Tab-separated table of C-alpha atoms and ligand atoms in Angstrom:
chain	number	residue	atom	x	y	z
C	1	UNK	CA	-103.588	15.717	-128.144
C	2	UNK	CA	-103.279	14.648	-124.504
C	3	UNK	CA	-100.165	12.434	-124.586
C	4	UNK	CA	-96.978	14.259	-123.608
C	5	UNK	CA	-93.764	13.917	-125.568
C	6	UNK	CA	-92.553	11.655	-122.766
C	7	UNK	CA	-95.629	9.442	-123.037
C	8	UNK	CA	-95.290	9.118	-126.814
C	9	UNK	CA	-91.577	8.331	-126.453
C	10	UNK	CA	-92.409	5.616	-123.929
C	11	UNK	CA	-94.858	4.073	-126.372
C	12	UNK	CA	-92.299	4.200	-129.202
C	13	UNK	CA	-89.341	2.877	-127.198
C	14	UNK	CA	-91.038	0.486	-124.720
C	15	UNK	CA	-94.125	-0.531	-126.696
C	16	UNK	CA	-96.750	0.465	-124.120
C	17	UNK	CA	-97.884	3.388	-121.966
C	18	UNK	CA	-100.178	3.647	-118.937
C	19	UNK	CA	-102.674	6.528	-118.445
C	20	UNK	CA	-103.925	6.302	-114.860
C	21	UNK	CA	-107.374	7.486	-113.864
C	22	UNK	CA	-108.768	8.226	-117.322
C	23	UNK	CA	-112.310	7.175	-116.256
C	24	UNK	CA	-114.027	8.029	-112.980
C	25	UNK	CA	-115.305	5.525	-110.396
C	26	UNK	CA	-118.865	6.277	-111.530
C	27	UNK	CA	-117.970	5.601	-115.167
C	28	UNK	CA	-116.275	2.328	-114.168
C	29	UNK	CA	-119.454	1.310	-112.335
C	30	UNK	CA	-121.563	1.918	-115.451
C	31	UNK	CA	-119.175	-0.180	-117.539
C	32	UNK	CA	-119.158	-2.995	-114.972
C	33	UNK	CA	-122.960	-3.075	-114.959
C	34	UNK	CA	-122.924	-3.301	-118.755
C	35	UNK	CA	-120.346	-6.067	-118.573
C	36	UNK	CA	-122.502	-8.051	-116.148
C	37	UNK	CA	-125.404	-7.765	-118.578
C	38	UNK	CA	-123.313	-8.565	-121.650
C	39	UNK	CA	-121.784	-11.700	-120.054
C	40	UNK	CA	-125.225	-13.360	-120.151
C	41	UNK	CA	-125.781	-12.906	-123.904
C	42	UNK	CA	-125.667	-16.197	-125.800
C	43	UNK	CA	-123.605	-16.472	-128.954
C	44	UNK	CA	-120.298	-17.400	-130.584
C	45	UNK	CA	-118.716	-14.159	-129.379
C	46	UNK	CA	-118.767	-15.561	-125.802
C	47	UNK	CA	-115.749	-17.757	-124.993
C	48	UNK	CA	-115.725	-19.918	-121.847
C	49	UNK	CA	-112.753	-21.006	-119.809
C	50	UNK	CA	-111.607	-24.541	-120.527
C	51	UNK	CA	-113.231	-25.658	-117.261
C	52	UNK	CA	-116.516	-24.079	-118.370
C	53	UNK	CA	-117.121	-22.421	-114.997
C	54	UNK	CA	-116.849	-18.789	-116.146
C	55	UNK	CA	-116.573	-16.604	-119.199
C	56	UNK	CA	-112.994	-16.124	-120.423
C	57	UNK	CA	-113.604	-13.573	-123.187
C	58	UNK	CA	-116.374	-11.566	-124.802
C	59	UNK	CA	-116.236	-10.088	-128.304
C	60	UNK	CA	-117.975	-7.037	-129.750
C	61	UNK	CA	-119.656	-5.790	-126.572
C	62	UNK	CA	-119.818	-2.340	-128.191
C	63	UNK	CA	-122.448	-3.675	-130.618
C	64	UNK	CA	-124.721	-4.667	-127.715
C	65	UNK	CA	-124.188	-2.183	-124.836
C	66	UNK	CA	-124.479	1.551	-125.454
C	67	UNK	CA	-121.805	2.477	-122.909
C	68	UNK	CA	-119.224	0.352	-124.690
C	69	UNK	CA	-120.117	2.033	-127.990
C	70	UNK	CA	-119.683	5.389	-126.204
C	71	UNK	CA	-116.383	4.227	-124.711
C	72	UNK	CA	-115.033	3.236	-128.117
C	73	UNK	CA	-115.654	6.761	-129.454
C	74	UNK	CA	-114.413	8.627	-126.363
C	75	UNK	CA	-111.727	11.205	-127.013
C	76	UNK	CA	-109.977	9.762	-123.950
C	77	UNK	CA	-109.216	6.680	-126.076
C	78	UNK	CA	-109.277	8.039	-129.640
C	79	UNK	CA	-107.240	11.141	-128.819
C	80	UNK	CA	-104.252	9.095	-127.696
C	81	UNK	CA	-104.689	6.423	-130.381
C	82	UNK	CA	-104.720	9.113	-133.087
C	83	UNK	CA	-101.594	10.771	-131.663
C	84	UNK	CA	-99.722	7.476	-131.965
C	85	UNK	CA	-100.906	6.422	-135.433
C	86	UNK	CA	-101.647	9.829	-137.042
C	87	UNK	CA	-104.529	8.580	-139.170
C	88	UNK	CA	-108.247	7.905	-139.313
C	89	UNK	CA	-109.176	4.854	-137.250
C	90	UNK	CA	-111.818	2.157	-136.916
C	91	UNK	CA	-112.355	-0.818	-134.607
C	92	UNK	CA	-110.484	-3.936	-135.734
C	93	UNK	CA	-111.292	-5.893	-132.581
C	94	UNK	CA	-113.221	-5.262	-129.348
C	95	UNK	CA	-112.750	-7.808	-126.583
C	96	UNK	CA	-113.115	-8.098	-122.835
C	97	UNK	CA	-110.848	-10.736	-121.278
C	98	UNK	CA	-112.670	-11.573	-118.039
C	99	UNK	CA	-110.156	-13.418	-115.867
C	100	UNK	CA	-112.112	-14.680	-112.875
C	101	UNK	CA	-110.952	-14.729	-109.289
C	102	UNK	CA	-109.981	-18.147	-107.944
C	103	UNK	CA	-108.622	-19.707	-111.088
C	104	UNK	CA	-109.064	-17.514	-114.182
C	105	UNK	CA	-106.716	-19.002	-116.755
C	106	UNK	CA	-103.556	-17.606	-118.337
C	107	UNK	CA	-103.024	-16.025	-121.760
C	108	UNK	CA	-100.061	-17.481	-123.632
C	109	UNK	CA	-97.065	-15.337	-124.536
C	110	UNK	CA	-97.578	-13.973	-128.047
C	111	UNK	CA	-97.536	-11.104	-130.506
C	112	UNK	CA	-100.896	-9.929	-131.872
C	113	UNK	CA	-99.928	-8.827	-135.363
C	114	UNK	CA	-98.759	-12.126	-136.843
C	115	UNK	CA	-102.126	-13.675	-135.930
C	116	UNK	CA	-104.065	-11.018	-137.802
C	117	UNK	CA	-101.588	-11.025	-140.705
C	118	UNK	CA	-101.739	-14.797	-141.239
C	119	UNK	CA	-105.367	-15.436	-140.273
C	120	UNK	CA	-107.031	-12.291	-141.592
C	121	UNK	CA	-104.674	-10.711	-144.113
C	122	UNK	CA	-103.998	-7.613	-142.029
C	123	UNK	CA	-101.289	-5.936	-144.162
C	124	UNK	CA	-99.196	-4.086	-141.569
C	125	UNK	CA	-99.011	-3.369	-137.810
C	126	UNK	CA	-100.656	0.057	-138.290
C	127	UNK	CA	-102.854	-0.536	-135.241
C	128	UNK	CA	-102.840	0.085	-131.480
C	129	UNK	CA	-104.302	-1.905	-128.600
C	130	UNK	CA	-106.137	0.205	-126.015
C	131	UNK	CA	-106.737	-1.488	-122.687
C	132	UNK	CA	-109.249	-0.206	-120.168
C	133	UNK	CA	-109.033	-1.616	-116.636
C	134	UNK	CA	-112.492	-2.610	-115.449
C	135	UNK	CA	-110.876	-4.075	-112.321
C	136	UNK	CA	-107.970	-2.835	-110.245
C	137	UNK	CA	-104.903	-4.485	-111.792
C	138	UNK	CA	-102.306	-5.634	-109.246
C	139	UNK	CA	-99.395	-8.078	-109.140
C	140	UNK	CA	-101.813	-10.692	-107.789
C	141	UNK	CA	-104.685	-10.957	-110.309
C	142	UNK	CA	-102.927	-11.949	-113.511
C	143	UNK	CA	-101.952	-8.636	-115.081
C	144	UNK	CA	-100.784	-8.342	-118.651
C	145	UNK	CA	-97.002	-8.688	-118.629
C	146	UNK	CA	-94.979	-7.113	-121.453
C	147	UNK	CA	-91.423	-7.803	-122.551
C	148	UNK	CA	-90.468	-4.149	-122.567
C	149	UNK	CA	-89.351	-2.877	-125.974
C	150	UNK	CA	-89.833	-6.271	-127.625
C	151	UNK	CA	-91.875	-4.748	-130.470
C	152	UNK	CA	-88.711	-3.197	-131.930
C	153	UNK	CA	-87.723	-6.620	-133.286
C	154	UNK	CA	-90.799	-6.627	-135.498
C	155	UNK	CA	-92.623	-9.886	-136.136
C	156	UNK	CA	-91.040	-13.149	-134.978
C	157	UNK	CA	-92.061	-15.635	-137.647
C	158	UNK	CA	-93.817	-18.881	-136.739
C	159	UNK	CA	-96.411	-21.246	-138.175
C	160	UNK	CA	-99.831	-21.697	-136.593
C	161	UNK	CA	-100.181	-24.782	-134.413
C	162	UNK	CA	-101.585	-27.752	-136.324
C	163	UNK	CA	-104.777	-27.775	-134.238
C	164	UNK	CA	-106.537	-24.734	-132.788
C	165	UNK	CA	-107.464	-24.417	-129.120
C	166	UNK	CA	-110.796	-22.733	-129.959
C	167	UNK	CA	-113.111	-22.538	-132.961
C	168	UNK	CA	-114.597	-19.226	-131.744
C	169	UNK	CA	-111.398	-17.142	-131.923
C	170	UNK	CA	-107.631	-17.589	-132.211
C	171	UNK	CA	-106.384	-18.262	-128.708
C	172	UNK	CA	-102.782	-16.982	-128.457
C	173	UNK	CA	-101.758	-20.577	-127.621
C	174	UNK	CA	-102.063	-21.189	-131.367
C	175	UNK	CA	-99.209	-18.696	-132.041
C	176	UNK	CA	-97.323	-18.857	-128.771
C	177	UNK	CA	-93.729	-17.773	-128.329
C	178	UNK	CA	-91.341	-20.628	-127.714
C	179	UNK	CA	-89.445	-20.916	-124.424
C	180	UNK	CA	-86.187	-20.423	-126.351
C	181	UNK	CA	-87.419	-17.194	-127.956
C	182	UNK	CA	-88.685	-15.874	-124.625
C	183	UNK	CA	-85.483	-16.801	-122.792
C	184	UNK	CA	-83.310	-15.047	-125.375
C	185	UNK	CA	-85.538	-11.977	-125.502
C	186	UNK	CA	-86.048	-11.317	-121.804
C	187	UNK	CA	-82.478	-10.151	-121.098
C	188	UNK	CA	-82.826	-7.026	-123.259
C	189	UNK	CA	-86.631	-6.833	-122.955
C	190	UNK	CA	-87.489	-7.375	-119.296
C	191	UNK	CA	-90.857	-8.301	-117.914
C	192	UNK	CA	-92.973	-5.326	-116.832
C	193	UNK	CA	-96.619	-5.116	-115.814
C	194	UNK	CA	-98.694	-1.930	-115.609
C	195	UNK	CA	-100.615	-1.902	-112.341
C	196	UNK	CA	-103.268	0.678	-111.537
C	197	UNK	CA	-106.820	1.198	-110.354
C	198	UNK	CA	-109.884	0.500	-112.445
C	199	UNK	CA	-110.540	3.249	-114.980
C	200	UNK	CA	-106.907	3.357	-116.067
C	201	UNK	CA	-106.009	3.057	-119.754
C	202	UNK	CA	-103.080	1.082	-121.224
C	203	UNK	CA	-101.965	1.516	-124.857
C	204	UNK	CA	-99.720	-1.163	-126.360
C	205	UNK	CA	-98.171	-2.094	-129.694
C	206	UNK	CA	-99.430	-5.030	-131.786
C	207	UNK	CA	-95.911	-6.515	-131.996
C	208	UNK	CA	-94.964	-6.350	-128.314
C	209	UNK	CA	-94.630	-9.755	-126.691
C	210	UNK	CA	-97.238	-10.036	-123.952
C	211	UNK	CA	-98.906	-12.697	-121.837
C	212	UNK	CA	-100.522	-13.151	-118.467
C	213	UNK	CA	-100.646	-15.683	-115.637
C	214	UNK	CA	-103.557	-17.430	-113.907
C	215	UNK	CA	-105.458	-15.414	-111.337
C	216	UNK	CA	-105.283	-17.252	-107.971
C	217	UNK	CA	-106.444	-14.181	-106.068
C	218	UNK	CA	-109.885	-13.404	-104.636
C	219	UNK	CA	-110.192	-10.475	-107.090
C	220	UNK	CA	-111.311	-10.669	-110.706
C	221	UNK	CA	-109.357	-8.991	-113.505
C	222	UNK	CA	-111.700	-7.749	-116.232
C	223	UNK	CA	-109.588	-6.182	-118.994
C	224	UNK	CA	-111.199	-4.513	-121.976
C	225	UNK	CA	-109.059	-4.135	-125.114
C	226	UNK	CA	-110.054	-2.141	-128.196
C	227	UNK	CA	-107.769	-2.578	-131.195
C	228	UNK	CA	-107.970	0.495	-133.421
C	229	UNK	CA	-106.712	0.135	-136.977
C	230	UNK	CA	-105.748	2.583	-139.701
C	231	UNK	CA	-108.680	2.789	-142.131
C	232	UNK	CA	-106.103	2.460	-144.936
C	233	UNK	CA	-104.840	-0.791	-143.380
C	234	UNK	CA	-108.050	-2.817	-143.654
C	235	UNK	CA	-107.580	-6.616	-143.819
C	236	UNK	CA	-107.356	-8.263	-147.233
C	237	UNK	CA	-108.237	-11.891	-146.447
C	238	UNK	CA	-107.459	-14.822	-148.729
C	239	UNK	CA	-110.423	-17.099	-147.962
C	240	UNK	CA	-113.711	-16.377	-146.246
C	241	UNK	CA	-113.335	-13.641	-143.605
C	242	UNK	CA	-113.721	-14.517	-139.961
C	243	UNK	CA	-116.881	-13.243	-138.238
C	244	UNK	CA	-117.349	-9.523	-137.755
C	245	UNK	CA	-117.508	-10.059	-133.989
C	246	UNK	CA	-113.784	-10.908	-133.970
C	247	UNK	CA	-112.533	-8.916	-137.019
C	248	UNK	CA	-114.138	-5.556	-137.740
C	249	UNK	CA	-115.329	-4.711	-141.244
C	250	UNK	CA	-116.875	-1.220	-140.977
C	251	UNK	CA	-113.963	1.073	-141.855
C	252	UNK	CA	-115.897	4.323	-141.414
C	253	UNK	CA	-113.557	6.715	-139.548
C	254	UNK	CA	-114.527	7.109	-135.900
C	255	UNK	CA	-115.221	10.639	-134.669
C	256	UNK	CA	-114.168	11.218	-131.083
C	257	UNK	CA	-116.666	12.525	-128.542
C	258	UNK	CA	-116.176	14.237	-125.198
C	259	UNK	CA	-118.184	13.917	-122.013
C	260	UNK	CA	-118.849	11.223	-119.436
C	261	UNK	CA	-119.994	7.687	-120.036
C	262	UNK	CA	-123.552	6.763	-119.012
P	1	HL5	C1	-103.784	-13.043	-130.325
P	1	HL5	C2	-105.240	-12.701	-130.024
P	1	HL5	C3	-105.351	-11.258	-129.540
P	1	HL5	O1	-104.678	-11.078	-128.293
P	1	HL5	C4	-106.041	-12.902	-131.322
P	1	HL5	C5	-107.553	-12.813	-131.086
P	1	HL5	N1	-107.962	-13.747	-130.052
P	1	HL5	C6	-108.278	-13.097	-132.395
P	1	HL5	O2	-109.013	-14.114	-132.477
P	1	HL5	O3	-108.126	-12.321	-133.378
P	2	MN	MN1	-102.840	-10.152	-127.448
């Protein structure tokens, strides 16, 4: 148990918490090399920007690169995730949102949970998102922005857009917050953005409202997000389940491991 009482309180009240410097520069380098290799793999798990010039998102890199499997079992991620949820955990979703320098596109304002509830039959928000900065995150390269404390409202109901932006995953556009909702909410739940060097870890709640702007800077923003889910909270889909690359199916409890990534 590494999170302090203050850190757990911040997660409960504000919906997110930043752990700076969890991984060393050398460990970041190993992960970036594995990302460069994984970005070249062909398949439906690889989502391009709308302009087709770069990758926008990669799914399930932990099934293809050893270091990302190691990362997902590291006690530096699972320790904190287990403190917050107090249960056995497994990977519901593993993604890297690779927002390129010089025009990497935005991510619409949204909550995560309603998407998984309505698309995948996820019963409850008994999950936690764990971000790992593979780039330095600054005000300039399209950081995740949270509406602080906005998870306390619970789920803000909406229907999925008639047509989907992508047939490879659910882009948050499909379930985006309306301008009216965001305008009402922001007075009590102000915009905040964790900013820190690569190797930092960011935990955030599946019902916090979050989004991010285009990256006009000369610096990329590669953000890895592992969504850990309570093994007792496995999805119960209505129709055919979505692919395993986007929605995890192996509910074996993960056992944390210590030591450096390689
Ligand atoms: C809302 C979004 C996660 O930030 C959903 C994810 N793209 C999925 O396809 O499950
Ligand atoms: Mn999200």
